[PDB]
Amino acid sequence: TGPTQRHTYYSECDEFRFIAPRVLDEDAPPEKRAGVHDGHLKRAPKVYCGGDERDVLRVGSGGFWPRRSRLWGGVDHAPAGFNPTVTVFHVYDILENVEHAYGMRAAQFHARFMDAITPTGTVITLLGLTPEGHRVAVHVYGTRQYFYMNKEEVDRHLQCRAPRDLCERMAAALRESPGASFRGISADHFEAEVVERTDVYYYETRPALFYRVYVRSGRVLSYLCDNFCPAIKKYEGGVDATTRFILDNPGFVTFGWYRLKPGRNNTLAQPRAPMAFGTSSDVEFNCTADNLAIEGGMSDLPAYKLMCFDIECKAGGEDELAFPVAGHPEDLVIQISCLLYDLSTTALEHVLLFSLGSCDLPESHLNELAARGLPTPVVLEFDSEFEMLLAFMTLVKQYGPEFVTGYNIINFDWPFLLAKLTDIYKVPLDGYGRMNGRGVFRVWDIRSKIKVNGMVNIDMYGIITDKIKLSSYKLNAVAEAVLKDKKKDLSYRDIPAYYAAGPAQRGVIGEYCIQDSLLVGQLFFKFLPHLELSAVARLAGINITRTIYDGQQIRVFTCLLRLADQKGFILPDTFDFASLYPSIIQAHNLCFSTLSLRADAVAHLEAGKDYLEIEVGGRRLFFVKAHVRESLLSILLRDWLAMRKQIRSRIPQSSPEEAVLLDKQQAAIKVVCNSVYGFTGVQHGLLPCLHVAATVTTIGREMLLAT
DNA sequence: TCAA
Ligand SMILES: [Ca+2]
Ligand SMILES: [Ca+2]
């Protein structure tokens, strides 16, 4: 039988491109000891360790690196009768995928889940850990994206008279799509209802009837928002399924503790069978949102794993002092240091060094690590670059570190590794994250960004350049400054000579690779960047990976979206002063919804008493005061500032451990409050209002001159 | 210069 959906990572391999420096051939005469061998070898990839040899892709008892994987290539390696009971689990990341009832027909899913994916549906996967350290995926069914269109405008443009009509019109526009990428679409793929809402822009704007349209897939939604009736303004078509799951279930969070519970008709979460697992988890469940609750009182982070890594590269062309380029076959990765920490206890658990060629670490370095009370390094030796890179990616899949760190890993180390795997070796990456295939594993340039499904990448270079002012942000300099530690260093121009000289000299390169990763680990546990990022994720209502890589706008957008829905609004698609701009927004009740550009909008009100009027950018603007209508931006700011004041009142009486968590929380509220002015001012952003931004600066200027 |  094997897995329901195919695993796309390598579980077997029997031929590969063998690339290796000729200088590793100790018996060869000097003329044959320069350059790189490059050819295809009919062999299983191998790793050597401490005199022993293994195939890289063999899973069994005697492995050279740790594993946290149940399945490998469709074989279950858990003990006989392994069946943990799961009540509470922590979520650190949320995936969003499409499933089809036809694809899942062989999996023994209950009918209530199959209905939610018939003929297709969006599944929300909560990625997490139990208190016992078991890796969990909880697949939540029944979440649908939805958008709005004005009822009268649709009724005149498409001649609709009942909601069923619009479902046909949309199905037609998809059937008629270029290349027929939306073959098989029908009115069953849709639901439409009539609801009363107000456009969030302007004070005079009246409530109106809208079609709220539900859809099964973001692929369909993005086609409709780009192509269906361009003359008709869409509302909230940009909102992802994760955001709907979080906002439509009061209290739910993208990072935190959850509990499984009985649903509405006493329904339960169903454990998946192993051959229906979508991820590299120990246990997986199908559930609906009513099977979930936020677990109160639990606050400790569970035993997530942090990988801290650094690569070392050697240029192989006619100038070994040229900077290495991944696209050149001869410019090799030669070493990868890889430190594995428990993120809850901060303890270093494993020190792995991957090495192209034999490598004997200095006794000096081994003694120092032993004196520091750290794990003895395991050196993994490879005959070729491919075998080493495959082994590293195999470790990433099998150990599955939830958090990954390093220095310049986003701008250099991942881009270099992934370019080798993709361009030189033709390896598919979509199975190497948490998902077993078809997952996101992507690098792109702006400096760079990364998305790996189920892996939170945190580059320490970004953290430190944001936190500390320094002349130089080289790691050696940062270390001297922040950790008061003066390490010894190898330059890129030492590496060619050390590499050619022999095993002991390649050992010196490894010592340096390991001490580099040890310093970065110390930086990480000093600044605790996962705690500030998770505090922002919880406050903003977005996942921690979106928190790192997306901009400031999505944080304010998601909070505004929550409040706007509660108030009946919908969002259309596109001496010193303490907190000057937030406090102007609050004191003057400035908002999208309190603004008027027209005098007749405020003719029923009294000037000064019921509204501000102000000249801004040459135009007369009106803002009604809070007793007429309270600003959404003002409410956000007020509630956040009240929350921050509450948190900071508790810090002096709290435990030394609690004080850290509270400090990260109060800091998260500051960064979000300060981004509100900016959010209004980004032209072509999410929900721009340049009138509000320009009013804030006009008031600010006048306050200084008044003072 | 800075990224190996
Ligand atoms: Ca390096
Ligand atoms: Ca690095």
Numbering used by the authors: 59 to 504, 512 to 639, 716 to 848
What do the authors report?
The HSV-1 DNA polymerase, encoded by the UL30 gene, forms a 190kDa heterodimeric complex with its processivity factor UL42 protein. The UL30 DNA polymerase has the characteristic fold of many polymerases, and although there is little sequence conservation, the UL42 protein is structurally similar to a single PCNA subunit but does not form a ring-like clamp.
The 1-bp mismatch active site closely resembles the exonuclease active site with the 2-bp mismatch DNA. The side chains adopt similar or identical orientations, and Y577 adopts a double conformation also in this structure. The DNA in the exonuclease state active site is better resolved in the 1-bp mismatch structure as compared to the 2-bp mismatch structure. It is, however, shifted compared to its canonical position adopted by the 2-bp mismatch structure. The 3′-terminal base of the primer adopts a similar conformation and stacks with the Y557 side chain. The penultimate primer base also stacks with the side chain of F381 in this state. The thiophosphate group is now interacting directly with metal B instead of metal A as was shown for the 2-bp mismatch structure. The coordination of metal B otherwise remains the same while metal A is lacking two of its coordination groups. Potentially a water molecule is located between the two metal ions but the map is too diffuse for unambiguous assignment.
